[PDB]
Design a protein around this ligand. Structure first.
Ligand SMILES: [Mg+2]
Ligand SMILES: [Zn+2]
Length: 183
């Protein structure tokens, strides 16, 4: 029913400084808020799908993630970017925090989060995009039938394996609207 842009968070929306969990260490990457507003204007739903194993690691709590996520959601809404959904996976099989220690269906490369978003927001997966900086993001997208897999260079220098699983490689999410328009 609606096309969406699925978005990784660290390395794609914010600079990945290391288990980011505080407002004062959350830096939006150049041009992404403007690009996101334009993607909403084009008609795309926007959905964040982020692995946050820092929670399972005990680096920060689900409460602190919630606080930072609320701050981010407000900051975007206030600049006219209303996110359609925000999904996150706090688990890790070796988690030190018992509550979050498990294999799950939501940890990318597993496509769980994308499937839930799909069912909840009625998303046309074939008309959608996944944007992220890691192999795991592109593997979750292929499992979820996302039409275009986009890798960005704003986080981790990509690996050849992440490149192989992607359809496009862009410098940044900032460049996605133009890249889509040229289609
Ligand atoms: Mg990332
Ligand atoms: Zn999970």
């Amino acid at each position: 029913s609606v096309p969406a842009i699925f978005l990784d968070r660290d390395g794609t929306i914010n600079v990945d400084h290391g288990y980011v969990h505080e407002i004062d260490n959350f830096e939006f990457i150049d041009g992404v808020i403007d690009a996101m507003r334009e993607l909403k204007k084009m008609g795309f739903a926007l959905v964040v799908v982020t692995n946050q194993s820092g929670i399972a690691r005990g680096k920060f709590t689900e409460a602190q993630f919630e606080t930072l996520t609320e701050w981010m959601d407000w900051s975007l809404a206030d600049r006219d970017v209303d996110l359609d959904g925000i999904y996150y996976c706090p688990h890790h099989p070796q988690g030190s925090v018992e509550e979050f220690r498990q294999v799950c269906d939501c940890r990318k490369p597993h496509p769980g989060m994308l499937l839930s978003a799909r069912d909840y927001l009625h998303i046309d997966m074939a008309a959608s995009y996944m944007v992220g900086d890691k192999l795991e993001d592109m593997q979750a997208a292929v499992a979820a039938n996302v039409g275009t897999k986009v890798l960005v260079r704003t986080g981790k220098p990509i690996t050849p394996e992440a490149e192989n699983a992607a359809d496009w490689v862009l410098n940044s999410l900032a460049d996605l609207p133009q890249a889509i328009k040229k289609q």
